[PDB]
Amino acid sequence: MKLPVREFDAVVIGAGGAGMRAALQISQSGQTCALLSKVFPTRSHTVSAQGGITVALGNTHEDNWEWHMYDTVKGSDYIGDQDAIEYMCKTGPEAILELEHMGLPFSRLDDGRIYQRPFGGQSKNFGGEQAARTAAAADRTGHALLHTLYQQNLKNHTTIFSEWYALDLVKNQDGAVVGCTALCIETGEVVYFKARATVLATGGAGRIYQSTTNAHINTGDGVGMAIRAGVPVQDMEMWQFHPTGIAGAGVLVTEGCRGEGGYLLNKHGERFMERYAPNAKDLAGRDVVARSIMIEIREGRGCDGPWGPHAKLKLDHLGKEVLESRLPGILELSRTFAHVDPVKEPIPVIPTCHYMMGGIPTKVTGQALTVNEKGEDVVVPGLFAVGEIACVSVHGANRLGGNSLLDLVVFGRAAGLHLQESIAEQGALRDASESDVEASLDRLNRWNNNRNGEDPVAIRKALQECMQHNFSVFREGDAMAKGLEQLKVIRERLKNARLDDTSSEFNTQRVECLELDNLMETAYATAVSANFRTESRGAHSRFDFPDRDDENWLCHSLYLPESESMTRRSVNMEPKLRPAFPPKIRTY
Amino acid sequence: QRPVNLDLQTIRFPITAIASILHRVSGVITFVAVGILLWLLGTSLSSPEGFEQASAIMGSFFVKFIMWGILTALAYHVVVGIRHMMMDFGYLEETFEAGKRSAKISFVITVVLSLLAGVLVW
Amino acid sequence: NGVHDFILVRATAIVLTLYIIYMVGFFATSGELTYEVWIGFFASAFTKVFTLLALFSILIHAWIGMWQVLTDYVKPLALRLMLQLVIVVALVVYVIYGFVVVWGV
Amino acid sequence: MRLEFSIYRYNPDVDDAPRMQDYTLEADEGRDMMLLDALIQLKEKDPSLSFRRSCREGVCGSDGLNMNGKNGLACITPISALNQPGKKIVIRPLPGLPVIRDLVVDMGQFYAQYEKIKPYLLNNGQNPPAREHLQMPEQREKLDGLYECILCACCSTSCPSFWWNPDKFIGPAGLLAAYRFLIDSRDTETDSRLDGLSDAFSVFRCTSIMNCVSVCPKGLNPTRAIGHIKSMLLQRNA
Ligand SMILES: *Cc1cc2c(cc1C)nc1c(=O)[nH]c(=O)nc-1n2C[C@H](O)[C@H](O)[C@H](O)COP(=O)(O)OP(=O)(O)OC[C@H]1O[C@@H](n2cnc3c(N)ncnc32)[C@H](O)[C@@H]1O
Ligand code: HEM
Ligand SMILES: CC1=C(C(=O)Nc2ccccc2)SCCO1
Ligand SMILES: O=C([O-])[C@H](O)C=C([O-])O
Ligand code: SF4
Ligand code: F3S
Ligand code: FES
Ligand code: NA
């Protein structure tokens, strides 16, 4: 060992909602736990989540976790694993009430109970009347959630390694994951964090696109880490494009706007969601709403101006009082980024890359999965994932608003509840050898030694433009094949990219270069997967295969890093507490 | 050991902060001034000769200038101190706006007292 | 504790504000300042008491205030305690010298 | 149109002390960017320039800076609000904190003051609710203006009292947080919290300088929160 070794029962990589929940739980369950984050924990993307948490509390009206299950399975266009979705919606209420007891400042009904608002994909009685089940703190729910969780972690004295950058997983000779190496951003010191359970909770990767609602820090580090370790990633082609990013800025305005009564208009003032989704209207699922807006634009019914092509999101009829009380956050965002006051004018919006349905496949326990040569699932000893980085999968081909925050909490908690069983089940793991650790550092070492290589800024811009043009809302056989080819070129350039800042004290260039490798693996995996799935389901839409194919594609797609090829995994359809919801035609 | 950015000449201070630093400075000045006023008072009271002697000291233009400074610093500490206490007791609002208005009115009131002081001393 | 300071500093500031209104009153309404009308004012029981009260008030109010300043700008312990010593003695001197000047009138 | 900057630089393995460096940036005339857009662009041309950022929407609190002498977030400060004919745009680290590198400050003492006031729900468990704690809208409104804090440190790093005693004075942001728990109806440790805030320094170093309010990117008002704490302290100890 020529590298300091810091040993813990668990190392949680990421301190967003998922990671902070898991750490809290792992800790209370009596094991030692290091919580790593490449930013101060309260600056993780969860902080920006607006609309709230979808969960059947039954406060605004009688509800039923089975109704929420139906909505989610239907919303996922039938490739969401039903046993896992069952677990989420049934467990949810308890998990969310628990956050309220940690002090989360929810908004309130007149009787004192948690406020819930309508949101997209919400129905009573299995597809009936519109429901209101998203629990909220104005439109700052993610902020409220994240701060509350950090506070709980302070109160529990969690051991937090703030501003450490995880480089790569460390594997032992048996193929088990036994921790990871990380770079302390302040000092430059590199360390091996040794663990019996390494929990990836690194969030999404919207920055592979040219326009995203995601923070700059969403670079798919978890995807890249898994891939480089030989761990497969799943459903990578399933990218949710939120319907309402601010045109010309990418900054999100919550679906809360529509849940509170706002709606979308085109250049002629048609409320076109009545035409495209006669039932749920503006509160239809996101894949559908996003496509609808893009069709309106492509056919010359979109609007224009300083912001570029867009649809109008009309809110002014809700009134100043309701706007300032339930939606203060988008008031600020619209005035600042669009120069539009929502109280008097519609907000210029356009679909914007938002959330990553794909990720590392996991069981409900958070344990990461791989497949052997016969295609059977095999647990990866030592590895776990929770949150946006994971693909459980509870979101299938299209996530419901409100369901990500629920996911972080339910699954972060679950990984913690189950960690002891998971560690016992996997057995003692053999120590990493010195070169096992050294292998983790190869990628870092290349950057440190490359001075005259290519400019990483040009590579990132090419990467992002490629994804924007070829793997956006509508996709095409030809364009995707060409995009994939360009990525291969871009990816070769990156193996020769230079790092111009060579210093060690808070050197952010090195971090951003390291990040770019992860943008690249994520983009590549996405593209290979998008070409592979020759059908249209949820957010994945192709003109060359416009239809949903339940005979050939009622399944997850799986990217295998060693061979760089694709395969399939079953979708689970065996809930324990009620019968499976059978695949059927999905319209809103 | 790590540097710190605390170069006061590179930082903007709003009126409220100016008001506040002056309140502190005026208070220190007043503390010294009390001794001086006492020194003067005691002279002026010890005998009829002490009194004329005090008048003669008050005659000097240099002394009038200082005595004016003392009275001005005192008026300032007092007025701005009352502003402070009106905030503490809820008579003045604590928004940034309210804080700007009240600082300004305080300056104005002080300038007036400073003249009434100048007159009293001339 | 700090609630104690907060209050005493303000109580004394109220007393001192009254004393200033009183002394300003006098000075602003007497014109010709002969040695006799002067000594007459300060001979008055009212003025003697009020003045001694003011001196006590300055003792407390300025002690608190100067303490606040010192504990912001004077870090080294020894230099600070010395400056506190000087300042406290000065303030006490003020009150005592005040007693000797007025009881002598 | 040409944009000119004077930016604070410091790297302990190169520099003996801090220094200001000049920067130029061709900008599109007909379009107005944020300071963070500029910073990110400057880095493309000088890769060694370090600064913090993330959400780029004024929510995460990463990129507090001192801009033309006044604190704020780069990500929501438009260039047009900083630009003056024949002057440079001057960018320096938040004042009073140790500087790690370039525009990156060590926020440790800021986070320490936050922890000192115990920023988490303290509930004694008696009279548990059937489900969520019931909190009426009137009681919930008391939290508005307090929970929105993004821990950016714009306020505290602009407070002289915090500069002189960063380890004794809690500072505006922290006291804002303390009040958030002091008036949460669900928190039952109000008295005990106040007993820990009674010394000469924690709260009382705040003397209404009011630099906190003007810089808060979220439009919060520490002065007012502090005022309320002071009342509670008197109601209890006087
Ligand atoms: C983008 C977005 C998403 C969003 C939303 C609003 C916006 C603007 N509003 C939502 C809502 O109202 N309801 C809901 O259910 N979901 C909403 N979303 C989606 C959701 O917020 C995100 O999926 C979710 O917040 C992700 O949470 P998660 O815990 O999974 O991840 P994160 O918040 O980004 O945290 C990432 C952490 O990982 C650390 N990290 C990343 N890479 C590294 C490396 N290399 N080393 C060490 N740490 C790393 C980050 O520091 C961070 O701590
Ligand atoms: C008579 C001689 C006086 C002297 C020598 C004096 C001195 C001081 C000093 C040194 C301070 C501390 C300064 C700081 O913390 O910045 C102070 C604070 C203060 N002064 Fe006075 N003062 C006098 C009279 C008065 C009067 C009449 C008032 C009434 C308005 C007053 C109002 C205040 C108030 C309210 C504070 C409190 C601010 C705090 O608690 O920090 N002072 N004084
Ligand atoms: C700490 C404090 C003051 C302070 O030091 N103000 C200040 C000092 C230097 C530069 C600007 C303002 S003035 C009001 C009393 O409390
Ligand atoms: O519209 C939102 O608030 C947000 O985008 C919600 C989720 O769940 O992602
Ligand atoms: S109160 Fe305002 S300035 Fe102070 S830390 Fe919070 S958001 Fe930042
Ligand atoms: S800027 Fe500082 S002194 Fe008090 S009102 Fe403010 S915390
Ligand atoms: S970058 Fe998140 S606040 Fe400016
Ligand atoms: Na995912």
Coordinates of C-alpha atoms in Angstrom, one line a residue, chain A residues 66-387:
Chain A
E66 CA -52.8 0.6 -5.7
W67 CA -54.0 3.5 -7.6
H68 CA -50.5 5.0 -7.5
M69 CA -49.2 1.6 -8.6
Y70 CA -51.5 1.5 -11.6
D71 CA -50.5 5.1 -12.6
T72 CA -46.8 4.1 -12.3
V73 CA -47.0 0.9 -14.2
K74 CA -49.0 2.5 -16.9
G75 CA -46.7 5.5 -16.9
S76 CA -43.7 3.3 -17.4
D77 CA -45.3 1.9 -20.5
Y78 CA -45.1 -1.6 -19.0
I79 CA -41.4 -2.1 -18.6
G80 CA -41.4 -1.0 -15.0
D81 CA -40.7 -3.9 -12.7
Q82 CA -44.1 -4.5 -11.0
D83 CA -42.8 -6.1 -7.8
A84 CA -40.5 -3.1 -7.3
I85 CA -43.2 -0.5 -8.1
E86 CA -45.5 -2.3 -5.7
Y87 CA -42.8 -2.1 -3.0
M88 CA -42.4 1.7 -3.7
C89 CA -46.0 2.8 -3.7
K90 CA -47.0 0.7 -0.7
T91 CA -43.9 1.7 1.4
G92 CA -44.1 5.3 0.3
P93 CA -46.5 6.8 2.8
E94 CA -44.5 5.6 5.8
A95 CA -41.3 6.7 4.3
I96 CA -42.6 10.2 3.6
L97 CA -44.3 10.7 6.9
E98 CA -41.0 9.9 8.4
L99 CA -39.4 12.9 6.5
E100 CA -42.1 15.1 8.0
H101 CA -41.1 14.0 11.5
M102 CA -37.5 14.9 10.6
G103 CA -38.9 18.4 10.2
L104 CA -39.3 18.8 6.5
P105 CA -41.3 22.0 6.1
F106 CA -44.2 20.7 3.9
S107 CA -46.9 23.1 2.9
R108 CA -50.2 22.6 4.7
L109 CA -53.9 22.1 4.2
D110 CA -56.4 24.0 6.5
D111 CA -56.6 21.1 8.9
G112 CA -52.8 20.9 9.3
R113 CA -52.0 17.9 7.2
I114 CA -49.4 17.8 4.4
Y115 CA -50.5 19.6 1.2
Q116 CA -50.8 17.6 -2.0
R117 CA -51.2 19.0 -5.5
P118 CA -52.2 17.4 -8.8
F119 CA -49.4 16.3 -11.1
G120 CA -49.1 14.4 -14.4
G121 CA -50.0 10.7 -14.4
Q122 CA -52.3 10.8 -11.4
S123 CA -55.7 9.1 -11.3
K124 CA -58.3 7.7 -8.9
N125 CA -59.8 4.2 -9.4
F126 CA -57.3 2.9 -11.9
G127 CA -57.4 5.4 -14.7
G128 CA -60.4 7.5 -13.5
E129 CA -60.7 11.1 -12.4
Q130 CA -57.6 13.3 -11.9
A131 CA -55.9 12.8 -8.5
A132 CA -53.8 15.1 -6.4
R133 CA -51.1 13.1 -4.6
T134 CA -47.9 15.1 -4.9
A135 CA -46.8 16.3 -1.4
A136 CA -45.1 19.7 -1.6
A137 CA -43.1 22.5 0.0
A138 CA -44.3 25.4 -2.3
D139 CA -42.3 24.7 -5.4
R140 CA -39.0 24.2 -3.4
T141 CA -39.6 20.6 -2.3
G142 CA -36.2 19.3 -3.3
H143 CA -34.5 22.1 -1.4
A144 CA -36.7 21.3 1.6
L145 CA -36.0 17.6 1.3
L146 CA -32.2 17.9 0.9
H147 CA -31.7 20.4 3.7
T148 CA -33.8 18.3 6.0
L149 CA -31.7 15.2 5.2
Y150 CA -28.4 17.1 5.7
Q151 CA -29.7 18.3 9.0
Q152 CA -30.6 14.7 10.0
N153 CA -27.1 13.7 9.0
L154 CA -25.6 16.4 11.2
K155 CA -27.7 15.3 14.0
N156 CA -26.5 11.7 13.6
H157 CA -22.9 12.7 13.2
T158 CA -22.5 10.9 9.9
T159 CA -19.0 10.9 8.7
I160 CA -19.0 13.1 5.6
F161 CA -16.2 13.5 3.1
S162 CA -17.3 16.7 1.4
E163 CA -15.7 17.6 -1.9
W164 CA -14.1 14.3 -2.6
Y165 CA -14.2 13.0 -6.2
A166 CA -14.7 9.2 -6.6
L167 CA -12.4 8.1 -9.5
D168 CA -13.1 4.3 -10.0
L169 CA -14.4 1.2 -8.3
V170 CA -11.8 -1.2 -6.9
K171 CA -12.3 -4.9 -7.7
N172 CA -10.7 -7.9 -6.0
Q173 CA -9.3 -10.9 -7.9
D174 CA -12.8 -12.6 -7.4
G175 CA -14.5 -9.8 -9.2
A176 CA -16.0 -8.3 -6.1
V177 CA -16.2 -4.6 -5.6
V178 CA -14.3 -3.7 -2.5
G179 CA -14.4 0.2 -2.4
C180 CA -13.2 3.0 -4.6
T181 CA -10.4 5.5 -5.0
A182 CA -11.2 9.2 -4.6
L183 CA -9.5 12.5 -5.1
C184 CA -9.7 15.1 -2.3
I185 CA -10.5 18.2 -4.3
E186 CA -9.0 20.7 -1.8
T187 CA -5.6 19.0 -1.3
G188 CA -5.1 16.7 -4.3
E189 CA -4.5 13.7 -2.0
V190 CA -5.8 10.4 -3.5
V191 CA -7.1 7.7 -1.2
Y192 CA -8.5 4.2 -1.3
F193 CA -11.8 4.0 0.6
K194 CA -12.1 0.3 1.6
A195 CA -15.6 -1.0 2.2
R196 CA -17.7 -4.1 2.4
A197 CA -20.5 -2.2 0.6
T198 CA -19.9 0.5 -2.0
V199 CA -23.2 2.3 -2.7
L200 CA -23.3 4.4 -5.8
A201 CA -25.7 7.3 -5.4
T202 CA -24.2 9.7 -7.9
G203 CA -27.4 10.9 -9.6
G204 CA -28.1 11.6 -13.3
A205 CA -26.3 12.8 -16.4
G206 CA -28.3 15.4 -18.3
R207 CA -25.1 17.1 -19.3
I208 CA -24.5 14.6 -22.0
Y209 CA -27.0 16.8 -23.9
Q210 CA -26.6 20.3 -25.3
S211 CA -29.6 21.6 -23.2
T212 CA -30.6 20.1 -19.9
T213 CA -32.4 21.0 -16.7
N214 CA -29.5 19.3 -14.8
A215 CA -26.9 21.0 -12.8
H216 CA -23.3 21.1 -14.2
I217 CA -22.4 18.4 -11.8
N218 CA -24.7 15.8 -13.4
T219 CA -22.1 14.0 -15.5
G220 CA -23.0 10.3 -15.0
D221 CA -19.9 9.5 -12.9
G222 CA -21.8 6.4 -11.6
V223 CA -22.5 5.1 -15.1
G224 CA -18.9 5.6 -16.2
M225 CA -17.6 4.0 -13.0
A226 CA -19.8 0.9 -13.5
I227 CA -19.0 0.5 -17.1
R228 CA -15.2 0.7 -16.5
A229 CA -15.6 -2.0 -13.8
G230 CA -17.5 -4.4 -16.2
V231 CA -20.9 -3.8 -14.6
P232 CA -23.7 -3.5 -17.1
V233 CA -26.2 -0.6 -17.3
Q234 CA -29.8 -0.9 -18.3
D235 CA -32.5 1.0 -20.3
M236 CA -29.9 3.7 -21.1
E237 CA -32.0 4.8 -24.1
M238 CA -34.9 5.9 -21.8
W239 CA -34.2 9.6 -21.4
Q240 CA -37.0 11.7 -20.0
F241 CA -37.3 15.1 -21.6
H242 CA -39.3 17.2 -19.2
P243 CA -42.0 19.0 -21.2
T244 CA -41.4 22.5 -19.7
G245 CA -37.8 23.7 -19.6
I246 CA -37.5 27.5 -20.2
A247 CA -36.8 28.0 -23.9
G248 CA -33.3 29.4 -24.5
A249 CA -32.1 28.6 -21.0
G250 CA -32.9 24.9 -20.1
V251 CA -33.8 25.9 -16.5
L252 CA -36.9 23.9 -15.3
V253 CA -40.3 25.2 -14.5
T254 CA -42.3 22.7 -12.4
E255 CA -45.0 20.5 -13.7
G256 CA -46.5 22.0 -10.6
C257 CA -47.6 24.9 -12.9
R258 CA -49.9 22.6 -14.8
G259 CA -50.9 20.7 -11.6
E260 CA -52.2 24.0 -10.1
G261 CA -54.3 24.8 -13.2
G262 CA -51.8 26.1 -15.8
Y263 CA -51.9 24.9 -19.4
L264 CA -50.0 24.9 -22.7
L265 CA -50.9 27.1 -25.8
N266 CA -49.5 27.2 -29.3
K267 CA -49.1 30.3 -31.6
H268 CA -52.9 30.2 -32.4
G269 CA -53.9 30.0 -28.7
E270 CA -55.1 26.4 -29.0
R271 CA -54.9 24.4 -25.8
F272 CA -53.5 21.6 -27.9
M273 CA -53.2 19.0 -25.1
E274 CA -57.0 18.5 -25.4
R275 CA -56.4 17.3 -28.9
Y276 CA -53.4 15.0 -28.0
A277 CA -54.6 13.7 -24.6
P278 CA -58.4 14.1 -24.3
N279 CA -58.5 12.7 -20.8
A280 CA -55.5 13.9 -18.8
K281 CA -54.9 16.9 -21.0
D282 CA -52.0 18.9 -19.7
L283 CA -51.4 16.4 -16.9
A284 CA -50.7 13.5 -19.3
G285 CA -47.5 11.5 -19.0
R286 CA -44.2 13.3 -19.8
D287 CA -43.2 11.4 -22.9
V288 CA -46.6 12.2 -24.5
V289 CA -46.6 15.9 -23.5
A290 CA -43.0 16.4 -24.7
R291 CA -43.8 14.8 -28.1
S292 CA -46.9 16.9 -28.4
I293 CA -45.1 20.1 -28.0
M294 CA -42.4 19.1 -30.5
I295 CA -45.0 18.2 -33.1
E296 CA -46.7 21.5 -32.7
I297 CA -43.3 23.2 -33.3
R298 CA -42.3 21.0 -36.3
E299 CA -45.6 21.8 -38.0
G300 CA -45.2 25.6 -37.7
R301 CA -47.6 26.1 -34.8
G302 CA -44.9 26.9 -32.2
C303 CA -44.0 30.5 -31.3
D304 CA -40.8 32.4 -31.7
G305 CA -38.9 35.4 -30.4
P306 CA -35.7 36.0 -28.3
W307 CA -36.1 32.6 -26.6
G308 CA -36.2 30.5 -29.8
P309 CA -38.9 28.0 -30.8
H310 CA -41.3 27.3 -27.9
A311 CA -44.8 26.8 -26.6
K312 CA -46.6 29.1 -24.2
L313 CA -47.3 28.0 -20.6
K314 CA -50.2 30.2 -19.4
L315 CA -50.4 30.8 -15.6
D316 CA -51.8 34.3 -15.3
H317 CA -55.4 33.1 -14.7
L318 CA -54.3 31.5 -11.5
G319 CA -53.8 34.9 -9.8
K320 CA -50.9 36.6 -8.1
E321 CA -51.8 35.2 -4.7
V322 CA -51.8 31.5 -5.7
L323 CA -48.8 32.1 -7.8
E324 CA -46.8 33.7 -5.0
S325 CA -47.9 31.1 -2.4
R326 CA -47.6 27.8 -4.3
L327 CA -45.2 28.6 -7.1
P328 CA -42.9 31.4 -5.9
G329 CA -39.8 29.5 -7.2
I330 CA -40.8 29.6 -10.9
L331 CA -41.8 33.2 -10.5
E332 CA -38.1 33.9 -9.8
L333 CA -36.9 31.5 -12.5
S334 CA -39.1 32.9 -15.2
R335 CA -38.3 36.5 -14.4
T336 CA -34.6 35.9 -14.3
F337 CA -34.1 33.5 -17.2
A338 CA -36.9 34.4 -19.6
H339 CA -37.5 38.0 -18.6
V340 CA -41.1 37.1 -18.4
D341 CA -43.4 37.7 -15.4
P342 CA -45.7 34.6 -15.2
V343 CA -48.4 36.7 -13.4
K344 CA -49.0 38.7 -16.6
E345 CA -47.5 36.6 -19.4
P346 CA -47.1 32.9 -20.4
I347 CA -43.7 31.3 -19.9
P348 CA -41.8 30.3 -23.1
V349 CA -41.2 26.6 -22.6
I350 CA -39.7 23.7 -24.6
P351 CA -39.0 20.0 -23.8
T352 CA -35.6 19.7 -22.2
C353 CA -33.4 16.7 -21.2
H354 CA -34.3 16.1 -17.6
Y355 CA -34.0 12.7 -16.0
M356 CA -32.2 9.3 -16.6
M357 CA -34.6 6.3 -16.4
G358 CA -31.7 4.0 -17.1
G359 CA -28.8 3.1 -14.8
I360 CA -27.2 0.3 -12.8
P361 CA -29.7 -2.5 -12.5
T362 CA -30.5 -3.3 -8.8
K363 CA -32.7 -5.4 -6.6
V364 CA -35.1 -3.7 -4.1
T365 CA -32.3 -4.2 -1.6
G366 CA -30.1 -1.9 -3.6
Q367 CA -27.7 -4.7 -4.5
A368 CA -26.3 -4.3 -8.0
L369 CA -26.9 -6.9 -10.7
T370 CA -25.0 -8.3 -13.6
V371 CA -25.7 -11.3 -15.9
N372 CA -23.6 -14.5 -16.4
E373 CA -23.0 -16.2 -19.8
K374 CA -26.4 -17.9 -19.7
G375 CA -28.1 -14.6 -19.2
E376 CA -29.1 -15.2 -15.6
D377 CA -29.0 -12.4 -13.0
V378 CA -26.1 -12.5 -10.7
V379 CA -25.5 -10.1 -7.8
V380 CA -22.2 -8.1 -8.0
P381 CA -20.7 -8.8 -4.6
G382 CA -19.8 -5.5 -2.8
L383 CA -21.7 -3.1 -5.1
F384 CA -25.0 -1.3 -4.5
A385 CA -26.9 1.6 -6.2
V386 CA -29.7 3.9 -5.1
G387 CA -31.5 6.8 -6.8

